[PDB]
PDB file of C-alpha atoms and ligand atoms in Angstrom:
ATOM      1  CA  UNK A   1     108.929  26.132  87.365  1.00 46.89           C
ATOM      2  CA  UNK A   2     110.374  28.283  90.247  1.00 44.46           C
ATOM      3  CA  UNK A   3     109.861  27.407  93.849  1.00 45.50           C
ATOM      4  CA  UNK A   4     110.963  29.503  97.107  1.00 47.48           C
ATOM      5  CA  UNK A   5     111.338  29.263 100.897  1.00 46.50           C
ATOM      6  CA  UNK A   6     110.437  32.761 102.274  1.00 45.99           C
ATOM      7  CA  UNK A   7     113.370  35.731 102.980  1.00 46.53           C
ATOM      8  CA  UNK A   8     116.763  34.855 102.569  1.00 46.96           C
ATOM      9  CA  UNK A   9     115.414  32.686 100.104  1.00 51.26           C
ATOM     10  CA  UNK A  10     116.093  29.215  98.673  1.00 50.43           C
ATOM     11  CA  UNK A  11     114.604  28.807  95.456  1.00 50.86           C
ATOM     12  CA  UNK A  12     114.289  25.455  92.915  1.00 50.09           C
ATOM     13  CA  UNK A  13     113.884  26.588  89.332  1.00 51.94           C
ATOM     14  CA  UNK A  14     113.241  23.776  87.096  1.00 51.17           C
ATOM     15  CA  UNK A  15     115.512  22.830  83.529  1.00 50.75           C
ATOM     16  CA  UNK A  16     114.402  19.395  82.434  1.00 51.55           C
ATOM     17  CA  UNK A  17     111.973  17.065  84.420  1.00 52.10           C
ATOM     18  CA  UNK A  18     114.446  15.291  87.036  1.00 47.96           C
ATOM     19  CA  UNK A  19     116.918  18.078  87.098  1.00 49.67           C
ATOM     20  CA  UNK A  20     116.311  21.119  89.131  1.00 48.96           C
ATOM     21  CA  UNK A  21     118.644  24.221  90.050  1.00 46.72           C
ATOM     22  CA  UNK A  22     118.553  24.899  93.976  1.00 47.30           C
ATOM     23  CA  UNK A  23     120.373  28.501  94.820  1.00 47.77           C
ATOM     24  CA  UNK A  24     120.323  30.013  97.627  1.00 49.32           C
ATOM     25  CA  UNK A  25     121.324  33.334  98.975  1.00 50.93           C
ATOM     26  CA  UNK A  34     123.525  33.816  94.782  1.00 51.11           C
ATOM     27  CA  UNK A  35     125.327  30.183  95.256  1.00 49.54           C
ATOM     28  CA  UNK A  36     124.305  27.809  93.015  1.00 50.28           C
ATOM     29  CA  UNK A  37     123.263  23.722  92.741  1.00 46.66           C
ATOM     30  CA  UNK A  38     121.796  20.835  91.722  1.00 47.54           C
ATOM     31  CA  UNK A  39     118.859  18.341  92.556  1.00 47.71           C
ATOM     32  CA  UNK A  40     118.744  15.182  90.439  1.00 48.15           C
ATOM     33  CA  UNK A  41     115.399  13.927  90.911  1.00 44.67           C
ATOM     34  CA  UNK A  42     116.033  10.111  90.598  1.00 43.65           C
ATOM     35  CA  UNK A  43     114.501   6.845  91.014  1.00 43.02           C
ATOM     36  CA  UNK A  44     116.193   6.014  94.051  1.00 42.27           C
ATOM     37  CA  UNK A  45     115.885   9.069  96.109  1.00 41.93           C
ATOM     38  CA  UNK A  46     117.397  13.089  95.509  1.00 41.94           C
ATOM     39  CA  UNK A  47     120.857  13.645  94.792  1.00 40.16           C
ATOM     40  CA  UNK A  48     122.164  17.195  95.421  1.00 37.31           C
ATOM     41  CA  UNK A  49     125.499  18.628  93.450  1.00 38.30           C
ATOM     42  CA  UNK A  50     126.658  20.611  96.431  1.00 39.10           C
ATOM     43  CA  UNK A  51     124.658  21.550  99.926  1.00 39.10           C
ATOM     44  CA  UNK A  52     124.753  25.293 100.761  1.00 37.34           C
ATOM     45  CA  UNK A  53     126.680  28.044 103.144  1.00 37.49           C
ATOM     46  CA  UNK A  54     125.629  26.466 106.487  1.00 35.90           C
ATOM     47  CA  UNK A  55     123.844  24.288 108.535  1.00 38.10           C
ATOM     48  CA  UNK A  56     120.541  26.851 108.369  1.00 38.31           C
ATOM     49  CA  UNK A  57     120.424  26.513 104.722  1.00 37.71           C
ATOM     50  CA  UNK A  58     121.119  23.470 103.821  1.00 36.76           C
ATOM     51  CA  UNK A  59     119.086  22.195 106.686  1.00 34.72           C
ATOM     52  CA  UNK A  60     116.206  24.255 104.807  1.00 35.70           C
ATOM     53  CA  UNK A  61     116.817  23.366 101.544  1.00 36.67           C
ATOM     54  CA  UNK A  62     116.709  19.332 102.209  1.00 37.85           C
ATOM     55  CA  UNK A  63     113.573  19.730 103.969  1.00 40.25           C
ATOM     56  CA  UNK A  64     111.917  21.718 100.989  1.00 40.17           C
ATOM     57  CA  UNK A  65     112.815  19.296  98.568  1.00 40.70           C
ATOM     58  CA  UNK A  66     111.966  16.191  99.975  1.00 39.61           C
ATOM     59  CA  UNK A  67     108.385  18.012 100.649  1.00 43.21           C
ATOM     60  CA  UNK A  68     107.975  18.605  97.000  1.00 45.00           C
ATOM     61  CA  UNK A  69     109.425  15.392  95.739  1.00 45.12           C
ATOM     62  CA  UNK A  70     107.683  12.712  98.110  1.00 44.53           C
ATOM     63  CA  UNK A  71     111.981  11.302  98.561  1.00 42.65           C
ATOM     64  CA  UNK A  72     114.834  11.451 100.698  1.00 42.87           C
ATOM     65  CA  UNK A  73     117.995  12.936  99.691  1.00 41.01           C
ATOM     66  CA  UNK A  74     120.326  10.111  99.648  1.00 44.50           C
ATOM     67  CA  UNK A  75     123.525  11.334  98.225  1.00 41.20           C
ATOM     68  CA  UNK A  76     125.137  15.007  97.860  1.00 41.76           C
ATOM     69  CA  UNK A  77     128.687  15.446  95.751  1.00 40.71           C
ATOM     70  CA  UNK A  78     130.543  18.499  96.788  1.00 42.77           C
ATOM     71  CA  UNK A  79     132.568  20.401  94.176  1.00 44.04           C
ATOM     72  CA  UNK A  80     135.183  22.057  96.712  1.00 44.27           C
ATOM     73  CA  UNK A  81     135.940  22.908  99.991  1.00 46.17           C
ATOM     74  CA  UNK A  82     134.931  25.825 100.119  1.00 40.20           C
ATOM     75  CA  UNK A  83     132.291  27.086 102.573  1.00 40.02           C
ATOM     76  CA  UNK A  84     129.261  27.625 100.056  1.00 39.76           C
ATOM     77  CA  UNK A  85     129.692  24.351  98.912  1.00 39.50           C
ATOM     78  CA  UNK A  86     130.862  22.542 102.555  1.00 36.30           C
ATOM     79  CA  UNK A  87     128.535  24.951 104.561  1.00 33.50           C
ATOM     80  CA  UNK A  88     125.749  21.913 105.515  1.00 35.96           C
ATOM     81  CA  UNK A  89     128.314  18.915 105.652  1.00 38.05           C
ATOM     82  CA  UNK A  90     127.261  18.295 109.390  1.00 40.22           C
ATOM     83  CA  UNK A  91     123.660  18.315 108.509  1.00 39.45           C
ATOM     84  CA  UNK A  92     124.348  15.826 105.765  1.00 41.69           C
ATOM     85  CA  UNK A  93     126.445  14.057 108.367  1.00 41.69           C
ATOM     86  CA  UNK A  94     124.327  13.732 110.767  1.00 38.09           C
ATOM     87  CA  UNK A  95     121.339  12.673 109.040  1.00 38.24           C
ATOM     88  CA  UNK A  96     122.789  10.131 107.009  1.00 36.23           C
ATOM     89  CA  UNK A  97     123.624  11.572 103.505  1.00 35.54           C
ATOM     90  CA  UNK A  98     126.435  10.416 101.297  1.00 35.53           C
ATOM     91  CA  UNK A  99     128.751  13.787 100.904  1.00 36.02           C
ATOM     92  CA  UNK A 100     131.027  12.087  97.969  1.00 40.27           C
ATOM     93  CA  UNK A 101     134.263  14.461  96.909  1.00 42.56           C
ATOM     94  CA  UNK A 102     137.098  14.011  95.558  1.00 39.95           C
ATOM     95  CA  UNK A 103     140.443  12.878  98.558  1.00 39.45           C
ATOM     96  CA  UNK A 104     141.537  16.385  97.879  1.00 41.60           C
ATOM     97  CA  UNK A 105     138.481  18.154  98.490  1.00 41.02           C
ATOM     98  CA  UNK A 106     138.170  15.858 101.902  1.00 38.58           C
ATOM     99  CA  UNK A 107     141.255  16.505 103.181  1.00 40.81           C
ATOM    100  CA  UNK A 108     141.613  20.324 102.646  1.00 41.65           C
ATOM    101  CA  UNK A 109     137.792  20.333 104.372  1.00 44.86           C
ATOM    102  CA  UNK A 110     140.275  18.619 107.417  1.00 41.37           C
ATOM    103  CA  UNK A 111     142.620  21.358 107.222  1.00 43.17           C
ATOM    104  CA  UNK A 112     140.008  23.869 107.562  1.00 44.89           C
ATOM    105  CA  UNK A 113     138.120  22.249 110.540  1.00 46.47           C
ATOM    106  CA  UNK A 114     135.140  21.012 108.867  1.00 44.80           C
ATOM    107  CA  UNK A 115     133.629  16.827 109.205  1.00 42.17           C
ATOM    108  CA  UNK A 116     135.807  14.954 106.173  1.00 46.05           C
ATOM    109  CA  UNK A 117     133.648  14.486 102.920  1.00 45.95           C
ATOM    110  CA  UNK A 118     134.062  11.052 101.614  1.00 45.42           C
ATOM    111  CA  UNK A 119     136.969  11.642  99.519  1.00 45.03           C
ATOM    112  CA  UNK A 120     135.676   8.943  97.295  1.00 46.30           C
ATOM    113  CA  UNK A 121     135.798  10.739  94.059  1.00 46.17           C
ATOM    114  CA  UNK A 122     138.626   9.719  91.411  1.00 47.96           C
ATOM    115  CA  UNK A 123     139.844  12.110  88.553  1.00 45.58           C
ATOM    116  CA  UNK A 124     136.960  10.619  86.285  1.00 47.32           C
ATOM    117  CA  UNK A 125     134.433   8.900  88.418  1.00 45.51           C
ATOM    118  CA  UNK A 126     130.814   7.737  86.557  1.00 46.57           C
ATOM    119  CA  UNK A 127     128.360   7.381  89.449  1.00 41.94           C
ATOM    120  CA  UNK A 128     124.531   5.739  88.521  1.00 39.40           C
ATOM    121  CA  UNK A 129     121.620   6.587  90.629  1.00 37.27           C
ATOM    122  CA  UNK A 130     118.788   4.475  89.455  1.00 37.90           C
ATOM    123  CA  UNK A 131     118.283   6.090  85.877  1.00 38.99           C
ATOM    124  CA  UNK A 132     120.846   8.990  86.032  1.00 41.19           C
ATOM    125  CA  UNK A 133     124.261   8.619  85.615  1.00 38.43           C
ATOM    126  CA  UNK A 134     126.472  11.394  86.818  1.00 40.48           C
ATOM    127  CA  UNK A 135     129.913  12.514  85.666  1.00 40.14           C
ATOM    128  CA  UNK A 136     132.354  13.863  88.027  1.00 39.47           C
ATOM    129  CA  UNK A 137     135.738  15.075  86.857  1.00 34.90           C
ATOM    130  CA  UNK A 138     138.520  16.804  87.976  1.00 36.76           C
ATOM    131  CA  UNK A 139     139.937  19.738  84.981  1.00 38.48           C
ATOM    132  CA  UNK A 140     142.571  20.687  86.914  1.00 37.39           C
ATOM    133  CA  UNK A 141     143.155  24.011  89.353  1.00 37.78           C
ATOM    134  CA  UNK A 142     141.124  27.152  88.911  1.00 40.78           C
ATOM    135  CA  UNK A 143     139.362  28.379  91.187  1.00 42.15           C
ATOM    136  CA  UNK A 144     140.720  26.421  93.421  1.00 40.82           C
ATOM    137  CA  UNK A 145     142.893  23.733  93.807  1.00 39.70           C
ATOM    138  CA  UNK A 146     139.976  20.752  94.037  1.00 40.27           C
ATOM    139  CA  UNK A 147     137.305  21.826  91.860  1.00 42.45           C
ATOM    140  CA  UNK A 148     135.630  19.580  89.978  1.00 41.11           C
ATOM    141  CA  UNK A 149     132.668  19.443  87.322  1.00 43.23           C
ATOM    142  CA  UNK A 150     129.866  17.477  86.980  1.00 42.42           C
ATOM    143  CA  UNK A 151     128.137  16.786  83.658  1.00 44.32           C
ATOM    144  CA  UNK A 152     125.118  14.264  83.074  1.00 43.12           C
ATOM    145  CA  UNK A 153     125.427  12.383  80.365  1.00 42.14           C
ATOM    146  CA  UNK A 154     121.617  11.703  79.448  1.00 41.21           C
ATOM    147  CA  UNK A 155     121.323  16.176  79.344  1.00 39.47           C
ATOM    148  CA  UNK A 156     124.094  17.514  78.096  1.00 40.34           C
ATOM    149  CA  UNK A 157     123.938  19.977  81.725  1.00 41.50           C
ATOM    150  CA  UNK A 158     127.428  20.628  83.225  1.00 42.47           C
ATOM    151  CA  UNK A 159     127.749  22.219  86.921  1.00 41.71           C
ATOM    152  CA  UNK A 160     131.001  23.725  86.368  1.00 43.84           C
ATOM    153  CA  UNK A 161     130.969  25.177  89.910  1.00 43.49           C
ATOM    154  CA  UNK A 162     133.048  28.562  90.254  1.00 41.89           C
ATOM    155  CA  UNK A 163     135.333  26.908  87.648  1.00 41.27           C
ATOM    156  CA  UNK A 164     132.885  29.328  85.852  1.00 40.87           C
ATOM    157  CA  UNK A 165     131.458  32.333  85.923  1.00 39.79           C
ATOM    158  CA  UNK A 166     128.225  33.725  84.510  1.00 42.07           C
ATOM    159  CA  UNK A 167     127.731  36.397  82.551  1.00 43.35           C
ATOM    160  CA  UNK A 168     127.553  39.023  84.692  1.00 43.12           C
ATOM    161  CA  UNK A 169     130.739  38.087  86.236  1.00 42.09           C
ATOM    162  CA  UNK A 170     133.049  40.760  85.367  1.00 44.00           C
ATOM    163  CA  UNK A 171     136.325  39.797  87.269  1.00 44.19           C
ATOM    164  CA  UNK A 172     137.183  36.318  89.058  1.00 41.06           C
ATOM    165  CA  UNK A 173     135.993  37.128  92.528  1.00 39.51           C
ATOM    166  CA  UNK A 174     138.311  35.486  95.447  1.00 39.47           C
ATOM    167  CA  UNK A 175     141.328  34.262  93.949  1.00 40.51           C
ATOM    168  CA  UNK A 176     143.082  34.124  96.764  1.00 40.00           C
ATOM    169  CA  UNK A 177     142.881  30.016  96.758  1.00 40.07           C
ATOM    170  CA  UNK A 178     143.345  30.152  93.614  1.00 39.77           C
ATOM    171  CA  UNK A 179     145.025  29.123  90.436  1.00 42.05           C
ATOM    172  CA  UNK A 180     144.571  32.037  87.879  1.00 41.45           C
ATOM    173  CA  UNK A 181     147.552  30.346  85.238  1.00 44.09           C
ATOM    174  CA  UNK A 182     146.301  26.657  85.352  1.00 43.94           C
ATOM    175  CA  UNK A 183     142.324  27.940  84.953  1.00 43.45           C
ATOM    176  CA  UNK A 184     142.549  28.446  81.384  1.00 41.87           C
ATOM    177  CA  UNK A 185     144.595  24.801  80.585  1.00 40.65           C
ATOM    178  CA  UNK A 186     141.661  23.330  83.098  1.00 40.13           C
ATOM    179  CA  UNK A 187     138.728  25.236  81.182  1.00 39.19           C
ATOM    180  CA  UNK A 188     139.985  24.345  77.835  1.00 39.30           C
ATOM    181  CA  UNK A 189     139.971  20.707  79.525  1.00 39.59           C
ATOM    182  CA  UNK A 190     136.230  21.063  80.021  1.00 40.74           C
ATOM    183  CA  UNK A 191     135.616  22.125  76.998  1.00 39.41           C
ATOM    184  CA  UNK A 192     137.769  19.171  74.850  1.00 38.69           C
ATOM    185  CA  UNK A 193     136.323  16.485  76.908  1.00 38.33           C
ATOM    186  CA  UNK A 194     132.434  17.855  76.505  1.00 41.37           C
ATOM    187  CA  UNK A 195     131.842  18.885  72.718  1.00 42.01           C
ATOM    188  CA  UNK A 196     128.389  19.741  72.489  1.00 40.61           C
ATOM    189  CA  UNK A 197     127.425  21.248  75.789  1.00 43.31           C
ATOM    190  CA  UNK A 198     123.360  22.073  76.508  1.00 46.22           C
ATOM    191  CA  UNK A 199     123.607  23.844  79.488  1.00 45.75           C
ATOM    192  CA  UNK A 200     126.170  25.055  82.012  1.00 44.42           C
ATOM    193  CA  UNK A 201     125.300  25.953  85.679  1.00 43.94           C
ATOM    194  CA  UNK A 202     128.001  28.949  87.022  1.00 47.25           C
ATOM    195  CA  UNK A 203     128.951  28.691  90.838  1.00 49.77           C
ATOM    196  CA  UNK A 204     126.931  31.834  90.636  1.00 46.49           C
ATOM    197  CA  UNK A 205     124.494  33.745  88.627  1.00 44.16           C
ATOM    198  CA  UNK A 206     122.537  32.942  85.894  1.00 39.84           C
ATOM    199  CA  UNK A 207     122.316  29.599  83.945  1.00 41.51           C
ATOM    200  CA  UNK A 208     123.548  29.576  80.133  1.00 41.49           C
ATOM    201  CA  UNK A 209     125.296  27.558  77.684  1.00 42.16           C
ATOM    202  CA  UNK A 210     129.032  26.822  76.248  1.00 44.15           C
ATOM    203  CA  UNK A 211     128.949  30.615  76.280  1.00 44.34           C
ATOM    204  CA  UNK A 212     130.263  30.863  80.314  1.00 45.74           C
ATOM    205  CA  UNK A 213     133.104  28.546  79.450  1.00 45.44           C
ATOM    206  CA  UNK A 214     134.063  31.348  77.074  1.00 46.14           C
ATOM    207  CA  UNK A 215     133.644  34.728  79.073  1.00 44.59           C
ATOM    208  CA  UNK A 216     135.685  32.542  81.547  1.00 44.49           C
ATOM    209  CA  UNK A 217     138.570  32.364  79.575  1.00 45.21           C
ATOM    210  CA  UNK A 218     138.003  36.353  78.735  1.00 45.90           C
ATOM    211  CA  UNK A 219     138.402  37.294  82.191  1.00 44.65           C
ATOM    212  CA  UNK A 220     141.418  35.316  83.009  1.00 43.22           C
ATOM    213  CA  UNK A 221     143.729  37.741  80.470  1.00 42.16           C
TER     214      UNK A 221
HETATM  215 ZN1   ZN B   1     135.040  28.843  96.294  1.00 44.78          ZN
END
């Protein structure tokens, strides 16, 4: 199913029952509809649209967002961390990912994260891990054991992704050792959300490689 806001939209298309993509403008995310409330993989630019985008879904799915994890501290992923802040959502990243949101002047994520962390809300259990730079220094995936669905943030790139976009924070000779990471430590891959663009499969991990030589 696919479900928008209205102009500078915010839209939740729908992959299995539970799990939902949120983008909004492309940035992508996730919504893990759980038992014990929504958990988001990353909020949104700003304030405005995350703001927007946590009143939407707790509309549709009669529950609170209780918990958001943030892939890196980057604005598109950091945008709404006040928002979460304020109203009493967990914003779980890794220490480095909290502390370089402190160096750029944004409210300090949790920093809770370890290299391999297996969180467990009510039936789903989430994998974070940390490949390695990239993109950028902190990113970090998240795959979900039960689907076989990896957010590999801008780790990866969809298809029409023809170069790597802003490198300057980034990591363009340790990407490929931190890709090939992803792919050794998740054989048998269902789908993979980009940071941006369209959804696919092991495919993006691929085209990834391609355009770092
Ligand atoms: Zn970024």
């Amino acid at each position: 199913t696919v479900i928008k806001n209205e102009t500078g939209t915010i839209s939740i298309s729908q992959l299995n029952k539970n799990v939902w993509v949120h983008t909004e403008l492309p940035s992508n995310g996730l919504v893990l509809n759980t038992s014990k409330g929504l958990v988001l993989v990353d909020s949104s630019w700003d304030d405005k649209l995350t703001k927007e985008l946590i009143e939407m879904v707790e509309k549709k799915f009669q529950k609170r967002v209780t918990d958001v994890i943030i892939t890196h501290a980057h604005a598109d992923r950091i945008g709404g961390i006040k928002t979460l802040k304020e109203r009493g959502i967990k914003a779980h990243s890794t220490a480095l990912t909290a502390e370089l949101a402190k160096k750029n002047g944004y409210e300090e994520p949790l920093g809770d994260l370890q290299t391999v962390t297996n969180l467990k809300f009510g039936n789903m259990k989430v994998e974070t891990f940390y490949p390695g730079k990239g993109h950028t220094e902190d990113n970090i995936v998240v795959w979900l054991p039960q689907y076989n669905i990896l957010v590999g943030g801008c780790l990866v790139k969809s298809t029409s992704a023809k170069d790597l976009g802003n490198v300057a924070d980034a990591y363009v000779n340790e990407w490929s050792t931190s890709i090939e990471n992803v792919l050794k430590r998740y054989r048998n891959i269902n789908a993979v959300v980009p940071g941006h663009g369209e959804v696919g499969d092991k495919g993006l991990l691929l085209h990834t490689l391609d355009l770092l030589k």
